[PDB]
Design a protein around this ligand. Structure first.
Ligand SMILES: NC(=O)c1ccc[n+]([C@@H]2O[C@H](COP(=O)([O-])OP(=O)(O)OC[C@H]3O[C@H](n4cnc5c(N)ncnc54)[C@H](O)[C@@H]3O)[C@@H](O)[C@H]2O)c1
Ligand SMILES: NC(=O)c1ccc[n+]([C@@H]2O[C@H](COP(=O)([O-])OP(=O)(O)OC[C@H]3O[C@H](n4cnc5c(N)ncnc54)[C@H](O)[C@@H]3O)[C@@H](O)[C@H]2O)c1
Lengths: 285, 275
């Protein structure tokens, strides 16, 4: 087709869905390069695609491991049209747990994938859009990049780190015609969190009884939030899509006004003391 | 003495000035574990402290490299007292430039030192505090951790990573007696050509030039920053943030005013590039 979109992190969730929405889109507009970290895990994208009947050629998958800077370089050359209209930054990793119980390897893959991963991504793909003076970069936000969430500290820094990188490049990209937009999402129903929790034992050995106590409390709180407010991957799909569509795009797109109030309280209290109060209260009463 | 403080990056700047000020406080109450990356760079500290009259024993130095879990562990192991009343997470690194011009290694070091290094201290030190149900963590934050800066993306992400990381413990730690705080700072005294394209190149150079003017306009002294740390340190109800200046408050308030990030991007693009 004609608008060339490239998405990172597609064997499931937001990537998968964002991918097949676009490949299936009726106006047959974009050609979607669904990249997966490990190509062996692609059957789900494929059925998805068939399930919505993406016309043949509207979608190609590639292997892209955001950890691997050659892997990135590699994907790129495999893009036939010699351009990327919209480049969607989506690969992520979660990390839930008492600060002092997280593995060193794990704090480093979260920041490698979440932060270094978007960095390596944008580095490979931004240059050429700057040249053409046209280009669109979409980056999956998280409420956790705007406000701090008990027991998700490392995850929070990466989401927070992502707004640091983005609003920073946004100021420089203005005049190029390359538009950067983070897509902040609240809880999305994808099993991003299924991949996230060690077991009681781990937690147990790893931390104090008190803290061990606060974690299940959050855990039970979060679940309830989840079950009461998560959106579907297809909903969020639609949000990249609109921002994607918009002719003069803002820096942020909300997938929900859900947390809006709370994001305001923050902004309204610079000592950051009020927000802490609430969160604390809302999470542990 | 009694308030045992452990502080990172102290051979120069805020670490040096915070380390000694404390050691020489007139209430002769803090014990200062000033730690450095290379002990072969510790003259000024000792010189400062010697020149400042510090109670014999009030100051000591350990070799910590926040990039090394094992180096973090031993420093910890060297705190004879057995508690840590004030842990000062201060070690940081800048990284500047055209993003597509930054090397992978520079990028990962700034994330290792600025972000993974505060994770390490915190995990070395918060459990004991939780236990005591007492302990203050002051963290050296930045302005660039508060809002985007052209040609500083990695840095800004590291510093923005700090905020969320600290903002996150701030909520949990509440109940255990521990308090966390970032001393938000402004400027403080103390391959490109090949890797980027023309337009990006000039902006880059335009940015630099203006930026060195503003630093000299803005830059405060370490002496001043340490005074904010100290205030914070005495706050019975110490907030999550403390600011060493109000130059960046307006901009701050702007940013929090338009959630879509649009105004800021404009204001700031404007500010760095006039025209
Ligand atoms: N699930 C939620 O509730 C939620 C909320 C807001 C934002 N997010 C963000 O959305 C994105 C996708 O999350 P999801 O909910 O779809 O979870 P998911 O795990 O279902 O999908 C994430 C995708 O990227 C991943 N990925 C991990 N490591 C990778 C690597 N090295 N290279 C390439 N890809 C890698 C996964 O393999 C998967 O393909 C991430 O940025 C996540 O942080 C998720
Ligand atoms: N100076 C400014 O204008 C300014 C602005 C805001 C925030 N900051 C922050 O101040 C902190 C550093 O103070 P500075 O800016 O005066 O820097 P500096 O370069 O003067 O500080 C040097 C000290 O930290 C170093 N260091 C580097 N890696 C280290 C590590 N892994 N462990 C321990 N020490 C390490 C050296 O050992 C030395 O001990 C960082 O958080 C920096 O981001 C400074």
């Amino acid at each position: 087709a004609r608008t060339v979109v490239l998405i990172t992190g597609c064997s499931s969730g937001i990537g998968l869905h964002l991918a097949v929405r676009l490949a299936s889109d009726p106006s047959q507009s974009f050609k979607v390069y669904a990249t997966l970290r490990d190509l062996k895990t692609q059957g789900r994208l494929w059925e998805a695609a068939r399930a919505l009947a993406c016309p043949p050629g509207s979608l190609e998958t590639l292997q892209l491991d955001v950890r691997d800077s050659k892997s990135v370089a590699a994907a790129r050359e495999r893009v036939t049209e010699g351009r990327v209209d919209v480049l969607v930054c989506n690969a992520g990793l979660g990390l839930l747990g008492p600060l002092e119980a997280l593995g060193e390897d794990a704090v480093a893959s979260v920041l490698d994938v979440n932060v270094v991963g978007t960095v390596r991504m944008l580095q490979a793909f931004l240059p050429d859009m700057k040249r053409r003076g046209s280009g669109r970069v979409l980056v999956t936000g998280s409420v956790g990049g705007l406000m701090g969430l008990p027991f998700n500290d490392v995850y929070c820094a990466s989401k927070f780190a992502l707004e640091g990188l983005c609003e920073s490049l946004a100021v420089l990209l203005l005049p190029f015609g390359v538009h950067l937009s983070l897509i902040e999402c609240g809880p999305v129903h994808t099993a991003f969190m299924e991949k996230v929790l060690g077991s009681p034992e781990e937690v147990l050995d790893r931390t104090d009884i008190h803290t061990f106590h606060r974690f299940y409390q959050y855990l039970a709180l979060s679940k309830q939030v989840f079950r009461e407010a998560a959106q579907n991957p297809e909903e969020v799909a639609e949000v990249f899509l609109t921002a994607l569509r918009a002719p003069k795009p803002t820096l942020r797109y909300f997938t929900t006004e859900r947390f809006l109030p709370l994001l305001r309280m923050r902004l309204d209290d610079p000592s950051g003391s009020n927000y802490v109060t609430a969160m604390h209260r809302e999470v542990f009463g």
